[PDB]
Amino acid sequence: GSHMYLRITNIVESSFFTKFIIYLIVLNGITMGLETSKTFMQSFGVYTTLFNQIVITIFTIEIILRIYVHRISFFKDPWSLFDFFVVAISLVPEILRVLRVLRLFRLVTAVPQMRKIVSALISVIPGMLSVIALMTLFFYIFAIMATCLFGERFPEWFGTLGESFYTLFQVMTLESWSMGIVRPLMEVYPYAWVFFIPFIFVVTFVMINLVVAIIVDAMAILNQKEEQ
Amino acid sequence: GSHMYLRITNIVESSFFTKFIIYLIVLNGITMGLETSKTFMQSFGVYTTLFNQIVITIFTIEIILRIYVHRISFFKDPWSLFDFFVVAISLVPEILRVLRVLRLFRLVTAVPQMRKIVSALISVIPGMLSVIALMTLFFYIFAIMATCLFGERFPEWFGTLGESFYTLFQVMTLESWSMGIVRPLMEVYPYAWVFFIPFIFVVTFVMINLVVAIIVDAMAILNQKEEQ
Amino acid sequence: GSHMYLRITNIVESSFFTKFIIYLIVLNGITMGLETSKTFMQSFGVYTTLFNQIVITIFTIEIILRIYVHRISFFKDPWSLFDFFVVAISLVPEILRVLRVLRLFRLVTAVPQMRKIVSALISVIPGMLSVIALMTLFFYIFAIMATCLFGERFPEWFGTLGESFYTLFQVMTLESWSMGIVRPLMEVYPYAWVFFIPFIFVVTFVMINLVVAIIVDAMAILNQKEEQ
Amino acid sequence: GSHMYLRITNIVESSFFTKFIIYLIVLNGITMGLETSKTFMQSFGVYTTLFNQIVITIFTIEIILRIYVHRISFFKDPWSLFDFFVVAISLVPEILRVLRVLRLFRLVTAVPQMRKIVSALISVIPGMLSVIALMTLFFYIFAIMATCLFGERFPEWFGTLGESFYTLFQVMTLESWSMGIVRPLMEVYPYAWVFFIPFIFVVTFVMINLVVAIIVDAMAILNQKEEQ
Numbered sequence A, B, C, D: 001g002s003h004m005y006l007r008i009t010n011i012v013e014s015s016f017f018t019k020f021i022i023y024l025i026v027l028n029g030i031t032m033g034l035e036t037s038k039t040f041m042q043s044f045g046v047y048t049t050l051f052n053q054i055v056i057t058i059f060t061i062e063i064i065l066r067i068y069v070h071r072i073s074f075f076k077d078p079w080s081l082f083d084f085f086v087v088a089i090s091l092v093p094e095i096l097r098v099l100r101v102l103r104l105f106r107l108v109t110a111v112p113q114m115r116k117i118v119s120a121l122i123s124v125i126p127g128m129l130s131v132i133a134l135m136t137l138f139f140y141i142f143a144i145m146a147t148c149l150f151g152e153r154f155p156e157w158f159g160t161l162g163e164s165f166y167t168l169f170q171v172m173t174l175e176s177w178s179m180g181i182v183r184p185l186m187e188v189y190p191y192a193w194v195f196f197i198p199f200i201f202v203v204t205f206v207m208i209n210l211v212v213a214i215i216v217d218a219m220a221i222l223n224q225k226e227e228q
Helices: A003-012 A015-034 A038-076 A078-089 A096-110 A112-123 A126-150 A161-172 A177-186 A190-225 B003-012 B015-034 B038-076 B078-089 B096-110 B112-123 B126-150 B161-172 B177-186 B190-225 C003-012 C015-034 C038-076 C078-089 C096-110 C112-123 C126-150 C161-172 C177-186 C190-225 D003-012 D015-034 D038-076 D078-089 D096-110 D112-123 D126-150 D161-172 D177-186 D190-225
Strands: none
Touching: A003 A038, A015 A038, A015 A096, A015 B126, A038 A078, A038 A096, A078 A096, A096 A112, A096 B126, A112 B126, A112 B190, A126 A161, A126 A190, A126 D015, A126 D096, A126 D112, A161 A177, A161 A190, A161 B177, A177 A190, A177 D161, A190 B190, A190 D112, A190 D190, B003 B038, B015 B038, B015 B096, B015 C126, B038 B078, B038 B096, B078 B096, B096 B112, B096 C126, B112 C126, B112 C190, B126 B161, B126 B190, B161 B177, B161 B190, B161 C177, B177 B190, B190 C190, C003 C038, C015 C038, C015 C096, C015 D126, C038 C078, C038 C096, C078 C096, C096 C112, C096 D126, C112 D126, C112 D190, C126 C161, C126 C190, C161 C177, C161 C190, C161 D177, C177 C190, C190 D190, D003 D038, D015 D038, D015 D096, D038 D078, D038 D096, D078 D096, D096 D112, D126 D161, D126 D190, D161 D177, D161 D190, D177 D190
């Protein structure tokens, strides 16, 4: 709480400061779409690599100041921890060059209207873990069974626990599940439909129950407020 | 508010007038389905091109009168602004010859039972913009990543930000997402599933949360009325 | 209300009578599944064609008695009008030989637990007509546009209003909409995505709003009862 | 209620006991994933077949003790009846070697947080039987019609009641229903769309009504509690 501290804290917690930073995120945003074009990169490639290293310096300063002001309150703030990690990524000198584009998610971290909706969304998840747990177990058990039942004749789709996880996931989205996977399978395993139809019933029932549960946990609130 | 004015206003705000106009929309409606057949156009093509230019004169008169009556109250009315734009389109002397068929939407503008439902539908959208914003950002960031990760080997699906937007949209509808796109992709990018499964989870979760939110914003009303 | 009348009315409105008829529907039911097999029809084909003509006599007697008892109260009863029409069909001496199997729906007409659910289901529809109207208009207008824009190069999918209706219906279910239809279309019509993505947005939005509306019209009731 | 009895009952109803058993389920769980790999089975195959026969002895002891304690209260407990049947399966000396993996569902039987969600899920089903009955009848009648209408030219998809059940199920999930099945069918049966579009409408409507009904049966409860 010294004189220097508060001088900084006045700049950081400024309107102008955020608006500045949101202006840059949006500008880098546009920059990163243009950098997607070889034509654009063939002419103005120099300029945008300059602008990229500028912005990422500015954001390191920005994150350093914010730490000066906020102390370990910073490192217990999700939105700040996010901002930390997306800028840190951008600092390391081939998948990482791409993961840089995750800095545009700073538009979410910095615009309150965005933060609101992301919070609303994420707060739905705790009441889902039990069902997600059930489901992940359901899949593990089926992935094993399928790997034994069909891996040898159908290595592409079932040769491996992971091939089976992937294929079972595809069947749950109902993508080409019959013409793509089960119809071919039955050409060797007449009774394969006894594995896949029950699998599709369980998985779809649980998804429906999952969504009904989000709709109720939501109404539970509205029918506490209106009880007052 | 002169004597001539009110003479017109009595005709325009008439029952007979609307019923007349709804009769023509329905008749032009039928006309435009028959004009779809070369056989029909080979014989009665003369007749229907007559009828088309008649109706569109009648509708210009109609829109001119309505402006006489309604003043700048007209140009702050969505339903009237719509009617203006669909008839204006039909006035310009090859995509435009087709866009003419948008005049059949005048059946919505003119039948109150229709206007009601279109209003109910459109009023749902403001409470969606935040999530739509989040989603459009989510897509922009993924469209960029995918264009870098897969464009070079997969130009058809990812060579361009726009190719990537289109392909990501297809993956969100779950259309051929695995047999069509990701299974082919993994034949070169074993770990592509780490991009597409998380993408499908986020996008589907948000869609579910979107719909749950429409169901709650709706119940919020019914549990204000019943609080009275 | 004579002595003969009431003698009949006592038989018709009997328990035993219904249970008898439900026993036959279930038995004809089983019969019609076995008649599906050439093997079974090669041996026991005589027997089941006997049993079929027996049951359909019995049901004509049954429907005649029920008319004796119920008068024009019969011909203002949906469930009875249904029973009339499915048995009448079965009386006419090649699609009609197949439509006979609609008599198994008599299991719905005759079992109250079934009638209940069918009523619950059908009562949902009146509050849908407006949206269905909107949608059918939406389709008519798009079916026309698509027939003009793509019929000439894509006759199979768009050459005709009806081909276009069918194809647009397929796009609304999202079945092969991109790999099957729009990706092929863009190979000649780069901008076809400007027709199909907006079409998919509108159609999906309306379906969601339709379902949210069924969920509210349902809650409107539960929050009238609990207002008492 | 003797001295020996209670000595056992103190062990069985122990914390330590369950935690032990949950530790083994999780350990066998891991074991059964590794047993999925020929590499792993080529080296450590001996070890895991040992561990498998150990665990399944331990679980037989476990189930025997639990019966000693619980009497016919055991054989009227779903969770215990389940545990009985999954271990019994594992005791019989080729599909059965695979069905063994169903013992990992003991993680559901033994973890209360899991039991809770499985109960929530299963309790939804009684209020669905009527609609499921309606649907199964709907399918039986359509499966018959389709087998007659398309089996002869389309044996793969319709030659048999069961082929037709399977194909109708695929059409209900909307998987390749038009490009895969109906478009091919119309190449011989122009009017096949009059069978499949109505089938898709009915089936989808009922599914929607089914889900709306789960959402209401759920709200019926929350608006009994808040009536108190």
